[PDB]
Coordinates of C-alpha atoms in Angstrom, one line a residue:
Chain A
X1 CA 2.3 -117.1 28.2
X2 CA 1.6 -120.1 30.5
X3 CA 4.8 -122.0 29.5
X4 CA 7.7 -122.6 27.1
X5 CA 9.5 -126.0 26.4
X6 CA 12.2 -127.0 24.0
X7 CA 12.5 -130.1 21.8
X8 CA 16.0 -130.8 20.4
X9 CA 15.7 -132.4 16.9
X10 CA 18.8 -134.2 15.5
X11 CA 18.8 -135.1 11.8
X12 CA 21.5 -137.8 11.4
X13 CA 22.6 -142.8 12.4
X14 CA 22.4 -146.7 12.3
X15 CA 20.4 -149.8 13.4
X16 CA 20.2 -152.5 16.1
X17 CA 17.8 -155.4 17.0
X18 CA 15.4 -155.0 20.0
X19 CA 13.4 -157.5 22.0
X20 CA 12.5 -157.5 25.8
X21 CA 13.3 -161.3 25.8
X22 CA 16.1 -163.5 24.3
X23 CA 15.1 -167.0 25.6
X24 CA 12.3 -169.0 24.0
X25 CA 10.9 -172.5 24.8
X26 CA 10.6 -175.1 22.0
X27 CA 7.1 -174.3 20.6
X28 CA 7.1 -170.7 21.9
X29 CA 7.7 -167.4 19.9
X30 CA 9.1 -163.9 20.4
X31 CA 8.4 -160.8 18.3
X32 CA 11.6 -158.9 17.3
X33 CA 12.0 -155.3 16.1
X34 CA 14.6 -152.8 14.8
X35 CA 15.5 -149.7 16.8
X36 CA 18.1 -147.1 15.7
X37 CA 21.6 -146.5 17.0
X38 CA 20.8 -143.1 18.7
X39 CA 17.5 -144.7 19.9
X40 CA 15.2 -144.0 16.8
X41 CA 12.0 -146.1 17.4
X42 CA 9.7 -147.3 14.5
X43 CA 7.5 -144.3 15.5
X44 CA 10.3 -141.8 14.3
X45 CA 11.5 -143.8 11.2
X46 CA 9.1 -146.7 10.5
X47 CA 7.0 -145.0 7.7
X48 CA 10.2 -144.1 5.7
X49 CA 11.4 -145.9 2.5
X50 CA 13.4 -148.4 4.6
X51 CA 13.4 -152.2 3.7
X52 CA 14.8 -154.7 6.2
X53 CA 16.3 -158.1 5.2
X54 CA 16.4 -160.4 8.2
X55 CA 18.4 -163.7 8.5
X56 CA 19.2 -166.5 11.0
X57 CA 22.6 -168.3 11.3
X58 CA 20.8 -171.6 11.9
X59 CA 17.0 -172.0 11.2
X60 CA 16.8 -175.5 12.9
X61 CA 17.2 -174.1 16.4
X62 CA 14.9 -171.1 15.7
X63 CA 13.0 -169.8 12.6
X64 CA 12.0 -166.4 11.5
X65 CA 8.2 -165.9 10.7
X66 CA 6.2 -163.0 9.0
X67 CA 3.7 -160.6 10.8
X68 CA 0.7 -160.8 8.3
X69 CA 1.3 -164.7 8.1
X70 CA -2.3 -165.7 7.0
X71 CA -2.2 -163.5 3.8
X72 CA 0.5 -166.0 2.6
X73 CA 3.3 -163.3 2.8
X74 CA 7.0 -163.9 3.6
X75 CA 9.6 -161.9 5.7
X76 CA 11.4 -160.9 2.4
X77 CA 8.0 -159.7 0.9
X78 CA 7.2 -157.8 4.1
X79 CA 10.7 -156.3 4.5
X80 CA 9.4 -155.3 8.0
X81 CA 10.9 -153.4 10.8
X82 CA 9.3 -156.1 13.1
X83 CA 9.3 -159.9 12.6
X84 CA 8.6 -163.1 14.7
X85 CA 11.0 -165.9 15.8
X86 CA 9.8 -169.4 16.8
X87 CA 11.7 -172.0 18.9
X88 CA 12.2 -175.4 17.1
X89 CA 15.1 -177.1 18.9
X90 CA 17.2 -176.3 22.0
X91 CA 20.5 -174.2 21.5
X92 CA 21.7 -170.7 20.8
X93 CA 21.3 -169.2 17.2
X94 CA 22.0 -165.7 16.0
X95 CA 19.7 -163.3 14.0
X96 CA 21.0 -160.4 11.8
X97 CA 19.3 -157.5 10.0
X98 CA 20.2 -155.1 7.1
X99 CA 18.5 -151.9 6.2
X100 CA 18.1 -150.9 2.5
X101 CA 15.9 -148.4 0.6
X102 CA 12.7 -149.8 -0.8
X103 CA 13.9 -148.2 -4.2
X104 CA 17.6 -149.3 -3.8
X105 CA 18.0 -153.0 -2.6
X106 CA 21.5 -153.5 -4.3
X107 CA 23.4 -152.3 -1.2
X108 CA 22.6 -151.9 2.5
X109 CA 22.6 -148.5 4.2
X110 CA 23.0 -150.0 7.7
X111 CA 23.6 -153.4 9.4
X112 CA 22.8 -154.4 13.0
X113 CA 25.0 -156.3 15.4
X114 CA 23.5 -159.8 15.6
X115 CA 21.1 -160.8 18.5
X116 CA 21.5 -164.3 20.0
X117 CA 18.2 -166.2 20.8
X118 CA 18.7 -169.1 23.2
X119 CA 16.0 -171.9 22.8
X120 CA 15.2 -173.9 25.9
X121 CA 14.3 -177.6 25.7
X122 CA 10.7 -178.7 26.6
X123 CA 9.7 -181.8 28.6
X124 CA 7.4 -183.7 26.1
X125 CA 4.6 -184.7 28.6
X126 CA 1.3 -182.8 27.8
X127 CA 0.7 -181.0 31.2
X128 CA -2.3 -178.6 31.7
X129 CA -0.7 -175.2 32.3
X130 CA -1.6 -171.7 33.5
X131 CA 0.6 -168.5 33.6
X132 CA -0.8 -165.7 35.7
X133 CA 0.5 -162.1 36.5
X134 CA 1.1 -161.3 40.2
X135 CA -1.8 -160.5 42.7
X136 CA -4.5 -161.7 40.1
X137 CA -7.7 -163.8 40.2
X138 CA -8.3 -166.6 37.6
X139 CA -11.6 -167.7 36.1
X140 CA -10.1 -171.1 34.8
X141 CA -12.3 -173.3 37.1
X142 CA -15.5 -171.7 35.8
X143 CA -14.2 -171.5 32.1
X144 CA -13.4 -175.3 32.1
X145 CA -16.7 -176.0 34.1
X146 CA -14.7 -177.6 37.0
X147 CA -17.2 -175.8 39.5
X148 CA -19.3 -178.9 39.9
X149 CA -20.1 -180.3 43.4
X150 CA -17.8 -183.2 44.3
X151 CA -14.8 -181.7 42.4
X152 CA -11.9 -181.1 44.8
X153 CA -8.6 -179.1 44.5
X154 CA -5.3 -179.9 46.3
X155 CA -2.0 -178.0 45.9
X156 CA 1.0 -180.4 45.7
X157 CA 4.3 -179.9 47.6
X158 CA 7.8 -181.0 46.5
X159 CA 9.5 -183.8 48.4
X160 CA 12.4 -181.4 49.1
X161 CA 9.8 -179.0 50.5
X162 CA 10.6 -176.2 47.9
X163 CA 7.0 -175.5 46.6
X164 CA 5.3 -173.7 49.5
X165 CA 2.4 -173.0 47.1
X166 CA 0.8 -170.7 49.8
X167 CA 3.5 -168.2 48.8
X168 CA 2.5 -168.2 45.1
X169 CA -1.3 -168.9 44.9
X170 CA -4.6 -169.3 46.9
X171 CA -7.6 -171.5 45.9
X172 CA -11.1 -170.8 47.3
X173 CA -14.8 -170.3 46.3
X174 CA -14.1 -172.3 43.0
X175 CA -11.5 -169.5 42.1
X176 CA -7.6 -169.5 41.8
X177 CA -5.7 -166.3 42.8
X178 CA -1.9 -165.5 42.3
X179 CA 0.0 -163.7 45.1
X180 CA 2.9 -161.2 45.5
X181 CA 5.7 -163.7 44.3
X182 CA 7.3 -165.3 41.3
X183 CA 7.1 -169.1 41.2
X184 CA 5.5 -172.4 40.1
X185 CA 2.6 -174.4 41.7
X186 CA 1.4 -177.9 41.0
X187 CA -2.3 -178.8 41.8
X188 CA -4.5 -182.0 41.5
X189 CA -8.1 -181.9 40.5
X190 CA -9.7 -184.8 42.4
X191 CA -13.4 -185.9 42.2
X192 CA -15.7 -187.9 44.6
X193 CA -12.7 -188.7 46.8
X194 CA -11.1 -190.5 43.8
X195 CA -7.4 -190.3 43.0
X196 CA -7.7 -192.8 40.1
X197 CA -10.1 -190.5 38.2
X198 CA -8.1 -187.3 39.2
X199 CA -6.1 -184.8 37.0
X200 CA -3.0 -182.6 37.4
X201 CA -2.1 -179.0 36.4
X202 CA 0.7 -176.3 36.6
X203 CA 0.3 -172.6 37.6
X204 CA 3.2 -170.2 36.9
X205 CA 3.2 -166.8 38.6
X206 CA 5.4 -164.1 36.9
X207 CA 5.7 -160.4 35.8
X208 CA 5.0 -159.7 32.0
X209 CA 8.4 -159.7 30.1
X210 CA 7.3 -159.0 26.5
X211 CA 4.4 -157.6 24.4
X212 CA 3.2 -158.6 20.8
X213 CA 0.7 -156.9 18.5
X214 CA -0.3 -159.4 15.7
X215 CA -3.1 -159.3 13.0
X216 CA -6.2 -161.4 13.6
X217 CA -6.3 -163.6 10.4
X218 CA -5.4 -160.9 7.8
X219 CA -6.5 -161.2 4.1
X220 CA -3.8 -158.7 3.1
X221 CA -0.8 -156.6 4.5
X222 CA -3.2 -153.6 4.0
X223 CA -6.3 -152.0 5.6
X224 CA -9.3 -150.4 3.6
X225 CA -10.2 -146.7 3.4
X226 CA -13.5 -146.8 5.3
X227 CA -12.8 -150.4 6.5
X228 CA -10.8 -152.0 9.4
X229 CA -8.5 -154.7 10.7
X230 CA -8.1 -156.1 14.2
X231 CA -4.9 -157.0 16.0
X232 CA -4.5 -159.1 19.2
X233 CA -2.1 -158.1 22.0
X234 CA -0.2 -161.1 23.4
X235 CA 1.8 -160.9 26.7
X236 CA 4.7 -163.3 27.3
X237 CA 7.2 -164.3 30.1
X238 CA 11.0 -164.6 30.0
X239 CA 10.7 -167.9 28.0
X240 CA 7.9 -166.8 25.6
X241 CA 5.1 -168.6 27.5
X242 CA 1.8 -166.8 27.0
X243 CA -0.2 -165.5 30.0
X244 CA -3.5 -167.4 30.3
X245 CA -5.5 -164.5 32.1
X246 CA -4.1 -160.9 32.2
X247 CA -6.1 -159.6 35.3
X248 CA -7.7 -156.1 35.6
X249 CA -4.3 -154.3 35.8
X250 CA -3.3 -155.0 32.2
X251 CA -4.5 -151.6 30.7
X252 CA -3.2 -151.0 27.1
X253 CA -2.5 -147.7 25.2
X254 CA -2.1 -147.0 21.4
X255 CA -0.3 -144.2 19.5
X256 CA -0.2 -143.2 15.8
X257 CA 2.8 -141.7 14.0
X258 CA 0.9 -139.8 11.3
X259 CA -2.6 -138.4 12.4
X260 CA -5.8 -139.0 10.5
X261 CA -4.4 -141.8 8.2
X262 CA -6.1 -144.3 10.7
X263 CA -8.2 -144.2 13.9
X264 CA -7.6 -146.9 16.6
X265 CA -9.9 -148.4 19.3
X266 CA -9.0 -151.0 22.0
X267 CA -11.4 -153.5 23.6
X268 CA -10.1 -156.0 26.1
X269 CA -6.6 -157.0 24.6
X270 CA -7.6 -156.3 20.9
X271 CA -6.7 -153.1 18.9
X272 CA -9.2 -152.6 16.0
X273 CA -8.0 -149.9 13.6
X274 CA -9.8 -148.2 10.6
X275 CA -8.5 -146.5 7.4
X276 CA -9.4 -142.8 6.8
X277 CA -6.7 -141.5 4.3
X278 CA -4.1 -142.9 2.0
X279 CA -0.5 -143.3 3.4
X280 CA 2.0 -145.3 5.4
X281 CA 1.6 -145.2 9.3
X282 CA 3.3 -146.8 12.3
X283 CA 0.9 -147.9 15.0
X284 CA 2.5 -148.1 18.5
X285 CA 0.9 -150.2 21.4
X286 CA 2.1 -150.5 25.0
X287 CA 1.1 -151.6 28.5
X288 CA -0.1 -148.2 29.9
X289 CA 1.6 -148.4 33.4
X290 CA 4.7 -150.4 32.3
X291 CA 5.6 -148.5 29.0
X292 CA 8.9 -150.5 28.6
Chain B
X1 CA 17.3 -113.3 64.0
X2 CA 20.5 -115.3 62.9
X3 CA 20.1 -118.5 65.0
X4 CA 16.3 -118.8 64.6
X5 CA 16.3 -122.3 62.8
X6 CA 17.3 -124.5 65.8
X7 CA 14.4 -123.7 68.4
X8 CA 12.4 -127.0 68.2
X9 CA 9.2 -127.2 70.4
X10 CA 10.0 -129.5 73.4
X11 CA 6.5 -131.0 73.2
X12 CA 7.6 -133.2 70.2
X13 CA 4.5 -134.4 68.3
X14 CA 3.9 -137.8 66.7
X15 CA 3.3 -138.1 62.9
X16 CA 1.4 -141.1 61.5
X17 CA 1.5 -141.7 57.7
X18 CA -1.6 -143.9 56.8
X19 CA -1.2 -146.0 53.6
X20 CA 4.5 -149.9 51.4
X21 CA 6.0 -148.3 48.3
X22 CA 9.6 -149.8 48.2
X23 CA 11.3 -152.8 49.7
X24 CA 15.0 -153.4 50.8
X25 CA 16.4 -156.9 51.2
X26 CA 19.1 -157.2 53.9
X27 CA 21.1 -160.5 53.4
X28 CA 24.5 -161.9 52.4
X29 CA 25.3 -162.5 48.7
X30 CA 27.1 -165.9 49.3
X31 CA 26.4 -169.1 51.3
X32 CA 28.1 -172.6 51.6
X33 CA 26.3 -175.9 50.6
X34 CA 24.7 -177.3 53.7
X35 CA 24.7 -173.9 55.7
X36 CA 22.1 -171.1 56.2
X37 CA 21.9 -167.3 56.2
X38 CA 19.0 -164.8 57.2
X39 CA 17.0 -162.5 54.9
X40 CA 15.3 -159.4 56.5
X41 CA 12.5 -157.7 54.5
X42 CA 12.4 -153.9 55.1
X43 CA 9.2 -152.2 53.9
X44 CA 9.1 -148.3 53.4
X45 CA 6.5 -145.6 52.8
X46 CA 5.9 -143.1 49.9
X47 CA 8.3 -140.8 51.9
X48 CA 11.1 -143.5 52.4
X49 CA 10.2 -143.9 56.1
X50 CA 10.2 -147.6 57.4
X51 CA 7.4 -149.7 58.9
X52 CA 8.0 -151.2 62.4
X53 CA 8.5 -155.0 62.8
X54 CA 5.2 -155.0 64.8
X55 CA 3.2 -154.4 61.4
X56 CA 4.6 -157.2 59.1
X57 CA 1.9 -159.4 60.7
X58 CA -0.6 -157.3 58.6
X59 CA 1.4 -157.6 55.3
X60 CA 1.1 -160.3 52.6
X61 CA 4.8 -161.0 52.0
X62 CA 5.3 -163.2 48.9
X63 CA 9.0 -164.3 48.1
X64 CA 10.2 -165.1 44.6
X65 CA 13.1 -167.5 43.7
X66 CA 14.2 -168.9 40.2
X67 CA 16.2 -172.0 41.4
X68 CA 14.8 -173.5 44.6
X69 CA 17.0 -176.7 44.1
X70 CA 20.2 -174.6 44.8
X71 CA 18.9 -172.3 47.5
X72 CA 15.8 -173.0 49.7
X73 CA 13.8 -170.5 51.8
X74 CA 11.5 -170.7 54.9
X75 CA 9.8 -167.9 56.9
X76 CA 10.9 -167.6 60.5
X77 CA 9.0 -167.0 63.8
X78 CA 9.3 -163.3 62.9
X79 CA 7.2 -162.4 59.9
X80 CA 9.9 -159.9 58.8
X81 CA 12.7 -162.6 58.6
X82 CA 13.2 -165.5 56.3
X83 CA 15.9 -168.3 56.6
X84 CA 17.8 -169.2 53.4
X85 CA 19.7 -172.5 53.0
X86 CA 22.3 -173.7 50.4
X87 CA 21.3 -177.2 49.0
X88 CA 23.8 -177.5 46.1
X89 CA 26.4 -175.3 44.3
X90 CA 25.2 -172.5 41.9
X91 CA 23.4 -169.1 41.6
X92 CA 19.8 -168.0 42.5
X93 CA 17.9 -164.8 41.6
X94 CA 15.7 -163.6 44.5
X95 CA 13.0 -160.9 45.1
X96 CA 10.1 -160.2 47.5
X97 CA 6.6 -158.7 46.8
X98 CA 4.6 -157.2 49.7
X99 CA 0.8 -156.9 49.0
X100 CA -1.9 -154.9 50.8
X101 CA -4.7 -157.5 52.0
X102 CA -7.3 -154.6 52.0
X103 CA -6.6 -152.8 48.6
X104 CA -4.7 -155.4 46.5
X105 CA -1.9 -152.8 46.0
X106 CA 1.6 -154.3 45.8
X107 CA 5.3 -153.2 46.0
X108 CA 8.3 -155.4 44.9
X109 CA 12.0 -155.3 45.9
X110 CA 14.9 -155.1 43.5
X111 CA 16.1 -158.5 42.3
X112 CA 19.3 -159.7 44.0
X113 CA 21.5 -162.7 43.2
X114 CA 22.8 -165.1 45.9
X115 CA 25.6 -167.6 45.1
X116 CA 26.0 -171.1 46.6
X117 CA 29.5 -172.8 46.9
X118 CA 32.5 -178.2 41.2
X119 CA 33.4 -181.7 39.7
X120 CA 35.0 -183.2 36.5
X121 CA 34.0 -186.2 34.4
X122 CA 35.5 -188.7 33.9
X123 CA 37.8 -188.6 36.9
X124 CA 40.1 -191.2 35.1
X125 CA 40.8 -191.2 31.3
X126 CA 42.9 -193.6 29.2
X127 CA 44.2 -192.7 25.7
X128 CA 46.6 -193.9 23.0
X129 CA 49.4 -191.4 21.8
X130 CA 47.7 -189.2 19.1
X131 CA 44.3 -189.5 20.9
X132 CA 42.0 -186.4 21.5
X133 CA 39.3 -185.7 24.2
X134 CA 37.3 -182.9 25.7
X135 CA 36.9 -182.8 29.5
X136 CA 33.3 -182.6 30.9
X137 CA 32.3 -180.9 34.2
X138 CA 29.3 -180.5 36.6
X139 CA 28.2 -177.9 39.0
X140 CA 30.1 -174.9 40.3
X141 CA 28.5 -171.5 39.3
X142 CA 27.7 -171.9 35.5
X143 CA 26.5 -168.2 35.1
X144 CA 29.6 -166.6 36.7
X145 CA 32.5 -169.1 36.5
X146 CA 35.7 -169.3 34.5
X147 CA 36.9 -172.9 34.3
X148 CA 40.7 -173.3 33.5
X149 CA 42.8 -176.4 33.1
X150 CA 46.4 -177.2 34.0
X151 CA 48.3 -180.4 32.9
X152 CA 51.1 -181.7 35.1
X153 CA 53.2 -182.6 32.0
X154 CA 52.3 -180.9 28.7
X155 CA 54.8 -183.3 26.9
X156 CA 52.7 -186.4 27.9
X157 CA 49.2 -184.6 27.6
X158 CA 48.8 -181.1 26.2
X159 CA 45.8 -178.8 26.2
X160 CA 44.4 -177.2 23.0
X161 CA 44.1 -173.4 22.9
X162 CA 46.0 -170.2 24.1
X163 CA 44.3 -169.5 27.5
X164 CA 43.5 -173.1 28.7
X165 CA 39.7 -172.5 29.0
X166 CA 38.4 -175.0 26.3
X167 CA 39.0 -178.3 28.2
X168 CA 40.2 -180.0 25.0
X169 CA 43.3 -182.3 25.5
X170 CA 45.7 -184.2 23.2
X171 CA 47.8 -187.3 24.2
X172 CA 51.4 -186.8 22.9
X173 CA 53.5 -189.5 24.6
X174 CA 53.2 -192.7 26.7
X175 CA 53.1 -191.7 30.4
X176 CA 50.7 -190.6 33.2
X177 CA 49.5 -187.0 33.9
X178 CA 47.1 -185.1 36.1
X179 CA 44.9 -182.3 34.6
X180 CA 43.8 -180.0 37.4
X181 CA 40.5 -178.2 36.6
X182 CA 39.8 -174.9 38.5
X183 CA 36.5 -173.1 38.7
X184 CA 36.9 -169.4 39.4
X185 CA 34.6 -166.3 39.7
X186 CA 35.6 -162.6 39.2
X187 CA 34.1 -160.3 41.9
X188 CA 32.2 -157.6 39.8
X189 CA 33.0 -154.8 42.3
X190 CA 36.7 -155.5 43.4
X191 CA 37.9 -157.5 40.2
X192 CA 39.2 -160.2 42.6
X193 CA 39.3 -163.8 41.3
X194 CA 38.1 -166.4 43.9
Chain C
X1 CA 10.8 -184.8 56.7
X2 CA 14.6 -185.4 55.9
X3 CA 15.3 -187.5 59.0
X4 CA 13.8 -188.4 62.4
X5 CA 15.6 -187.9 65.7
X6 CA 15.4 -190.4 68.6
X7 CA 17.0 -189.9 72.1
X8 CA 16.4 -190.7 75.8
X9 CA 16.3 -188.3 78.8
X10 CA 19.8 -187.6 80.2
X11 CA 21.4 -189.2 77.0
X12 CA 24.8 -187.9 75.7
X13 CA 23.6 -188.8 72.2
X14 CA 20.8 -188.8 69.6
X15 CA 20.1 -191.3 66.8
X16 CA 19.2 -190.1 63.2
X17 CA 16.8 -192.2 61.0
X18 CA 16.7 -191.2 57.3
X19 CA 13.2 -190.3 55.8
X20 CA 14.2 -188.4 52.6
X21 CA 17.3 -187.1 50.6
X22 CA 18.7 -183.7 51.5
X23 CA 20.5 -181.9 54.5
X24 CA 19.6 -182.5 58.1
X25 CA 21.1 -180.0 60.6
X26 CA 21.1 -181.1 64.3
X27 CA 21.5 -178.7 67.2
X28 CA 21.9 -179.1 71.0
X29 CA 21.2 -177.1 74.2
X30 CA 22.7 -177.5 77.7
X31 CA 19.9 -177.5 80.4
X32 CA 22.3 -176.4 83.2
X33 CA 24.7 -174.2 81.1
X34 CA 22.3 -172.8 78.3
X35 CA 23.9 -171.5 75.0
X36 CA 26.2 -168.5 74.0
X37 CA 23.3 -167.0 71.8
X38 CA 23.1 -164.0 74.3
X39 CA 21.8 -161.5 71.7
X40 CA 21.4 -158.6 74.2
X41 CA 25.2 -158.1 74.5
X42 CA 25.8 -158.7 70.8
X43 CA 23.9 -155.5 69.8
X44 CA 26.3 -153.2 71.8
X45 CA 29.5 -154.8 70.4
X46 CA 28.4 -154.7 66.7
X47 CA 29.0 -150.8 66.7
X48 CA 32.8 -151.5 67.2
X49 CA 33.4 -155.1 66.1
Chain D
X1 CA 33.4 -212.1 25.6
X2 CA 33.4 -208.6 23.9
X3 CA 33.6 -207.1 20.3
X4 CA 34.1 -203.7 18.7
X5 CA 33.1 -202.0 15.4
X6 CA 34.0 -198.7 13.7
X7 CA 31.1 -196.5 12.6
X8 CA 31.1 -193.3 10.5
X9 CA 28.0 -190.9 10.5
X10 CA 27.4 -188.3 7.7
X11 CA 48.9 -183.7 -1.3
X12 CA 49.1 -181.3 -4.4
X13 CA 45.5 -181.7 -5.6
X14 CA 44.5 -180.3 -9.1
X15 CA 40.8 -179.1 -9.0
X16 CA 38.1 -177.6 -11.2
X17 CA 36.4 -174.2 -10.8
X18 CA 33.3 -174.6 -8.5
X19 CA 34.6 -178.0 -7.1
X20 CA 34.8 -178.7 -3.3
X21 CA 37.3 -180.6 -1.2
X22 CA 38.1 -181.5 2.5
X23 CA 41.7 -181.2 3.6
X24 CA 43.0 -183.5 6.4
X25 CA 46.1 -184.1 8.6
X26 CA 48.1 -187.3 9.3
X27 CA 46.9 -187.4 13.0
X28 CA 48.6 -190.8 13.4
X29 CA 51.9 -189.2 12.3
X30 CA 51.5 -186.4 14.9
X31 CA 50.9 -189.1 17.5
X32 CA 53.9 -191.3 16.3
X33 CA 56.1 -188.1 16.7
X34 CA 54.7 -187.1 20.2
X35 CA 52.6 -184.1 19.0
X36 CA 49.1 -183.6 20.2
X37 CA 46.0 -183.4 18.0
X38 CA 43.9 -180.2 17.4
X39 CA 40.6 -179.8 19.2
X40 CA 37.1 -179.8 17.4
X41 CA 37.1 -176.0 17.5
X42 CA 40.8 -175.2 16.7
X43 CA 41.5 -172.7 13.9
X44 CA 44.4 -174.7 12.3
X45 CA 43.9 -174.0 8.5
Chain E
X1 CA 13.1 -188.2 28.9
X2 CA 16.4 -190.0 29.6
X3 CA 18.5 -186.9 28.6
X4 CA 21.0 -185.4 31.0
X5 CA 19.5 -182.5 33.1
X6 CA 16.0 -184.0 33.2
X7 CA 15.0 -184.7 36.9
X8 CA 12.1 -186.7 38.4
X9 CA 10.4 -185.9 41.8
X10 CA 7.4 -187.8 43.4
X11 CA 4.7 -185.5 44.8
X12 CA 3.1 -186.1 48.2
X13 CA -0.4 -185.0 49.2
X14 CA -0.7 -182.2 51.8
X15 CA -2.8 -184.6 53.9
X16 CA 0.2 -187.0 53.7
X17 CA -1.9 -189.7 52.0
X18 CA 0.3 -190.5 48.9
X19 CA 3.4 -192.3 50.3
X20 CA 4.5 -192.9 46.7
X21 CA 7.4 -195.2 48.1
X22 CA 4.6 -197.8 48.8
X23 CA 3.4 -197.8 45.1
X24 CA 6.4 -197.1 42.9
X25 CA 10.2 -196.6 42.7
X26 CA 12.1 -194.3 40.2
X27 CA 15.9 -194.9 39.4
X28 CA 18.4 -195.4 36.5
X29 CA 15.9 -193.5 34.2
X30 CA 13.3 -196.2 34.9
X31 CA 9.9 -196.3 36.7
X32 CA 8.9 -199.5 38.6
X33 CA 5.5 -200.4 40.3
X34 CA 5.5 -202.2 43.7
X35 CA 3.3 -204.7 45.7
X36 CA 0.4 -202.3 46.3
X37 CA -2.7 -200.7 44.6
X38 CA -2.6 -196.9 44.4
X39 CA -1.9 -193.6 42.6
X40 CA 1.3 -191.6 42.4
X41 CA 1.9 -188.0 41.1
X42 CA 5.4 -187.0 39.7
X43 CA 7.0 -183.9 38.3
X44 CA 9.5 -184.0 35.4
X45 CA 11.8 -181.0 36.1
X46 CA 14.7 -179.9 33.9
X47 CA 17.9 -177.9 34.5
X48 CA 16.6 -177.1 38.1
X49 CA 13.7 -175.2 36.5

């Protein structure tokens, strides 16, 4: 014997909502999920005959949305343990969920305590924006072909002196780089010494707050035996803004609740999965070195 | 044989750990509008041993603030020390990230919250008997504050509620009254209202 | 950037001229009598005070 | 030289099954008796 | 953009070139141009954010 170890299995309790964020901008989203009342993840219950009705107390502040959207499904047709919410108007609204059987939908087995989602107002002035993780280089200047001789870049300080942009980003060799700190920078792109032809942009620097696995233009809620579907991984901040470049530190992992039903493979931020046997399965995905 | 643990060698050696893995922030939690306090950034090793002040000149120290309009920051003539200043009333969440300018490795502090230390609108109201209004207010600490209201004569102007938090008022009789508004915070460690 | 100072040698006073909104802080040193910022002695007393 | 305009934005009743009604208070007769009005949020019914 | 909790801040160049005070004013939820030819940059902030 080279070791012994002891799993405690409890067979028992109830449901709650889960999200890593509860603020959303107008026009942003957040993906919500169910988790159990002991702590049961969709990896320990998600394949069972459980059907989830979701609801929102006002749908004008924020709306629910389905996961397999582009197949023309609805949240009531999905019955899913995970759903989306999109911000429409500023204010706080509350979301509730009930668990039924897939066979018995006449009465709920469990109900969650309702989550509030607080939608933040936008400023309706179309402003070129980046959102970068900490300590990370950005290819933006090359990707927009702003490399070209006679283009110039100038960080812009606040009149109260608050934006020391030197503490949030650097700009050199036709690159942008984020630093150790959380903040916002403003920058002008000038050309040929001309302020009248110039342009403006925002750079946010933040940690990742939330993660979302969503299907890349699905034709069904279902994946073929011998065929495959691809899912994109989105990373968001504390207001649902999507990170524009993830850096080389954003390593992903994937886990599978019932082995040999599927195989997974990750490339960049895309999980492609392939059907191998008939059944239900939960796919789990996480940021490797920040597994919360 | 019994006392053998305490005989150190008088030629005490030096030990150098070549590598920041954690950060402490040494600062006050409260500051007045218009005044300043100091933040000291302590960097530590994989073993919890500090780095000397003489090395923070080699460290890329990046501060992080949510609300720079309530509390501002500048770095001092010591790389390890930052000056904070209250600009208007409120709350601000603060952290610091130290990065390694040779390996790109980073460490970040815990987040901390600093508080800066209210008004009513309108300052004068006119009503007819049977008239209703809700008081508006600006500033204070809108993420930690109670606001409670007290009428000088509840028989001229009453408040609507049970606990006088709502700021709704009703004019009952011809007369003149003061409603005092009071913004208060509970200390989350001592339970003390301030 | 908030306000300019202007004073003459051996003046009792300084004039403030506004440049931007915010908070100016103004400070003064005595050239014959110094300042009570004598930090050496402040380190010993902190252990008791 | 001023003027004013009122703008609206949108006892023992006998009713029908499935009908709806809004109940109201003589605010004006609380006021004429020195009683205050309820607030917008006040659970008075 | 008139709505309470929106804020407007003129942005100066790091070379000090854009004295926006010589090109525009911003007050009472209005913008106004002045006597001079130039370019100004402005942020629209909200709720201190």
